[PDB]
Design an enzyme around this catalytic site. Structure first.
Site, PDB file in Angstrom:
ATOM      1  N   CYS A   1       3.327   1.491   9.509  1.00 30.16           N
ATOM      2  CA  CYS A   1       3.287   0.402   8.527  1.00 30.16           C
ATOM      3  C   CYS A   1       4.672  -0.047   8.090  1.00 30.16           C
ATOM      4  CB  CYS A   1       2.406   0.769   7.335  1.00 30.16           C
ATOM      5  SG  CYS A   1       0.728   1.251   7.797  1.00 30.16           S
TER       6      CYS A   1
ATOM      7  N   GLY B   1       2.233   5.962   9.929  1.00 24.41           N
ATOM      8  CA  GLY B   1       3.656   5.847   9.625  1.00 24.41           C
ATOM      9  C   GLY B   1       4.282   4.559  10.150  1.00 24.41           C
TER      10      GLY B   1
ATOM     11  N   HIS C   1       0.808  -1.216   0.000  1.00 18.89           N
ATOM     12  CA  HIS C   1       0.000   0.000   0.000  1.00 18.89           C
ATOM     13  C   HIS C   1       0.854   1.286   0.000  1.00 18.89           C
ATOM     14  CE1 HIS C   1      -0.074  -0.435   4.522  1.00 18.89           C
ATOM     15  NE2 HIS C   1       0.206   0.867   4.429  1.00 18.89           N
TER      16      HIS C   1
HETATM   17  O1  LIG Z   1      -4.234   1.410   8.533  1.00 20.21           O
HETATM   18  C1  LIG Z   1      -3.351   2.102   8.037  1.00 20.21           C
HETATM   19  C2  LIG Z   1      -3.399   2.541   6.585  1.00 20.21           C
HETATM   20  C3  LIG Z   1      -4.168   1.571   5.717  1.00 20.21           C
HETATM   21  C4  LIG Z   1      -5.489   1.815   5.369  1.00 20.21           C
HETATM   22  C5  LIG Z   1      -6.240   0.852   4.713  1.00 20.21           C
HETATM   23  C6  LIG Z   1      -5.675  -0.371   4.384  1.00 20.21           C
HETATM   24  C7  LIG Z   1      -4.349  -0.589   4.695  1.00 20.21           C
HETATM   25 CL1  LIG Z   1      -3.618  -2.119   4.295  1.00 20.21          CL
HETATM   26  C8  LIG Z   1      -3.589   0.362   5.344  1.00 20.21           C
HETATM   27  N1  LIG Z   1      -2.302   2.577   8.741  1.00 20.21           N
HETATM   28  C9  LIG Z   1      -2.193   2.515  10.148  1.00 20.21           C
HETATM   29  C10 LIG Z   1      -1.577   1.413  10.728  1.00 20.21           C
HETATM   30  N2  LIG Z   1      -1.519   1.230  12.050  1.00 20.21           N
HETATM   31  C11 LIG Z   1      -2.084   2.156  12.830  1.00 20.21           C
HETATM   32  C12 LIG Z   1      -2.725   3.284  12.367  1.00 20.21           C
HETATM   33  C13 LIG Z   1      -2.769   3.489  10.981  1.00 20.21           C
HETATM   34  C14 LIG Z   1      -3.393   4.734  10.388  1.00 20.21           C
HETATM   35  C15 LIG Z   1      -4.244   5.532  11.370  1.00 20.21           C
HETATM   36  C16 LIG Z   1      -3.602   5.607  12.742  1.00 20.21           C
HETATM   37  C17 LIG Z   1      -3.432   4.219  13.318  1.00 20.21           C
END
Ligand SMILES: O=C(Cc1cccc(Cl)c1)Nc1cncc2c1CCCC2
Ligand SMILES: O=C(Cc1cccc(Cl)c1)Nc1cncc2c1CCCC2
EC number: 3.4.19.12
Lengths: 304, 304
Positions: free
Chosen positions: A145, A143, A41
Site C-alpha cells: 500500500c 505492505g 488506512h
Molecule cells: O488490501 C489491503 C489492505 C486493505 C484492506 C481493506 C481496505 C483497504 Cl483500503 C486496504 N492491502 C493489500 C494491498 N494489496 C495487496 C494485498 C493486500 C493485503 C493482502 C495481500 C495482498
C-alpha cells in the site's frame, strides 16, 4: 525491433519512496517537496477496517504519531491532513530528490508503470493498464500500500495512481494522488463489485500495428470492414466500441505501416471470430490490450 | 496476489548511463568508478562493420576521439583499452552515483532486467531471460547498443549483459561486462546462426507454482509422473530436460503449495500434450518460461 511490456525507468520515483508508520501499521509514502502522501488506512487497525470512521480515527492522531522514514533518516512531521482517501503529512524538509512532477487522473484504458514497494523500499517495476472497470491487475503483497503508478515525459513524472487495496477477486484498487478512488471502490474491508470489464479495442489494434512493425504479419487478410460492422463484432466479444477518435489516434500507426485502420479492424474481426489457430503474435497466444497507440509509437521510435 | 513480468527498480543503473561518441557513431556507455564500458563497435563506420579489424581501427583512435557525456557534462578520457568486445575508457572522475556492483556471467535460463537507453538516456525497463541458445528476445532500436542487463541483491547491482546487436532474425546478442559474447556471436555484419532454442522447463514449472499461489489451479490433475517419463515428453516438445538439481531448486515452491514437483510435472505433461483448451494461466494463453524459481519466490514474498 522486438516488443516488450516496458515500464518507465523508475529512478525518479525511487528517490520519493518513504516508509510511513502509524501505530502498528506500516505502509509506503510518496515524499514530494515537503509533503508525504500515503493511503489514509495507515491510521487503522484490523479492528477498524470493517467500517472505519476515518475522521474520528484521525482525530486520535497527532503529528508525532506518524513516523516517516526515508531510508534510515527520520523526517519530522509538522502537519497532517486528510484529502479524500490520502493523508498528507507535512514534513520540515523538502525531498532533495524531488523530480519535476504532476498529479494526473488517468483515463481508463491508459497505461502506467508501477513501482511496487515494501517498507519504503522499491522491489520491482512493471507496466499496467487502468482497466475500463477502473481496477488494475497488478502484483502487490501485504505492505505494498502506498506504492504508486506513474508516467514520465522526459524529466516530468505524472503520478497517476496510489495503491490502496486488493479486492477479494485478486484485483487491485487505488486512488489518484488527490485520494479519489478510481472506480466505485471504498477503503473498507467489504465485498466490492468491480464492474464488467471489456477489452481495450484501440490498444489491441495498436498492438496489432506493433506486430506488423516487428515482422508478425500472418494475421493480415484481404478484407476490410466498417466502424458499424466491426462494432457489432466488438459487442459480441466484450471489446470496447471503436469510435472515430480511436481511428484518429491510430493515424500515426496506420501511416507507418500503410495499413488503413478499418483494414486492421478486419484482421481483428477475423482473430476474434476464428481465434489464433494455435499461432502467436509478438510472443502472445492472446490479444494484448495493455499497450496504447502512444506506447507502441514510443517503443517503436525510442523516446527517452 | 497477482503475477507480473517484473523488472528490478532501475535507479542505480540510470545513474551509470553515459553517451559515448567516436567519430560519427554514438551509443551508450556504463560509467562505474573511473571507467566507461561500451561495445567496441563504437569505433566502426558502416564501411567497417562487414569484417572489422578492431585492433587496427582502435590504433587510429586516441583518448580525445572518444567523447563521453554524462547528461550534459563532458568526461575527460585519460585511457582507452579493448577487452574482448568491450572498450574500457578510463576517465579522470569516478562516477559519484556508482552503486555497489559486480560483473557476472549469467547462465542460460536465468533472468535479468534491461534498461534500454538512447544517447545515454534511459527510455524503459523490462524483464528478460537469457535463452538456452544465448540470445535475448529484447526490445532494442538503433542507438540502443551499450544498454545493460542486470540483477539487484538489496544494494548490489550485478551487471550481466551489455547489448551489442540485433541478428537478422530480430533477436538480440550481446556480451558480459568483460566483453565476452553470450553464444557463438561475433561483432560483425554477417549472417549468424543462433542455435536451436528450447523452453526453460524449470521456469515453466516455477510459473505453474506461481499460478497455484495466485489462485489458478484448473490445470492441476490426479496424476503424477517420473523424471524419466516427463523427460520423454519434454524431448518431444523441445523443453529442457529436467534434472534432480531442477527438482531441488523447486523445493521451496513445492513446500509452499504442498504439490510435489513430479505431480506438477504431470500437470505440465498434460498441458504439453493437450494444450490449454482455450483457457489461460496467469493471464497467458501459452506456457511462460521467463520466471525462475527465485523470481517466483521473490515476487510472491516481497524482497526489496
Ligand atoms: O488490501 C489491503 C489492505 C486493505 C484492506 C481493506 C481496505 C483497504 Cl483500503 C486496504 N492491502 C493489500 C494491498 N494489496 C495487496 C494485498 C493486500 C493485503 C493482502 C495481500 C495482498
Ligand atoms: O545491430 C546493431 C549494429 C551492429 C551491426 C553489426 C554488428 C554489431 Cl556488433 C552491431 N545495432 C542494433 C542493436 N539492437 C537493435 C537494432 C540495431 C540496429 C538496427 C535496429 C535494431
Amino acid at each position: 525491433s522486438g516488443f516488450r511490456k516496458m515500464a518507465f525507468p523508475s529512478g525518479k520515483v525511487e528517490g520519493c519512496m518513504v516508509q510511513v508508520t502509524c501505530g502498528t501499521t506500516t505502509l509506503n509514502g510518496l515524499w514530494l517537496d515537503d509533503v508525504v502522501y500515503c493511503p489514509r488506512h495507515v491510521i487503522c487497525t484490523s479492528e477498524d477496517m470493517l467500517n472505519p470512521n476515518y475522521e474520528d480515527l484521525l482525530i486520535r492522531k497527532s503529528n508525532h504519531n506518524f513516523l516517516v522514514q526515508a531510508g534510515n533518516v527520520q523526517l519530522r512531521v509538522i502537519g497532517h491532513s486528510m484529502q479524500n482517501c490520502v493523508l498528507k503529512l507535512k514534513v520540515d524538509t523538502a525531498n532533495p530528490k524531488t523530480p519535476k512532477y504532476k498529479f494526473v487522473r488517468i483515463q481508463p484504458g491508459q497505461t502506467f508503470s508501477v513501482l511496487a514497494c515494501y517498507n519504503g523500499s522499491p522491489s520491482g517495476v512493471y507496466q499496467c493498464a487502468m482497466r475500463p472497470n477502473f481496477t488494475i491487475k497488478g502484483s502487490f503483497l501485504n505492505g505494498s500500500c502506498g506504492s504508486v503508478g506513474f508516467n514520465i515525459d522526459y524529466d516530468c513524472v505524472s503520478f497517476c495512481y496510489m495503491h490502496h487495496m486488493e479486492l477479494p477477486t485478486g484485483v487491485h484498487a487505488g486512488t489518484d494522488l488527490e485520494g479519489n478512488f478510481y472506480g466505485p471502490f471504498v477503503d473498507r474491508q467489504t465485498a466490492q463489485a468491480a464492474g464488467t470489464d471489456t477489452t481495450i479495442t484501440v490498444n489491441v489494434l495498436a498492438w496489432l500495428y506493433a506486430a506488423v512493425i516487428n515482422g508478425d504479419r500472418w494475421f493480415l487478410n484481404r478484407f476490410t470492414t466498417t466502424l458499424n460492422d466491426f462494432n457489432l463484432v466488438a459487442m459480441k466479444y466484450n471489446y470496447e466500441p471503436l469510435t472515430q477518435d480511436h481511428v484518429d489516434i491510430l493515424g500515426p500507426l496506420s501511416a507507418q505501416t500503410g495499413i488503413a485502420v478499418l483494414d486492421m479492424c478486419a484482421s481483428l474481426k477475423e482473430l476474434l471470430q476464428n481465434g489464433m489457430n494455435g499461432r502467436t503474435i509478438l510472443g502472445s497466444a492472446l490479444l494484448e490490450d495493455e499497450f496504447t497507440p502512444f506506447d507502441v509509437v514510443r517503443q517503436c521510435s525510442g523516446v527517452t
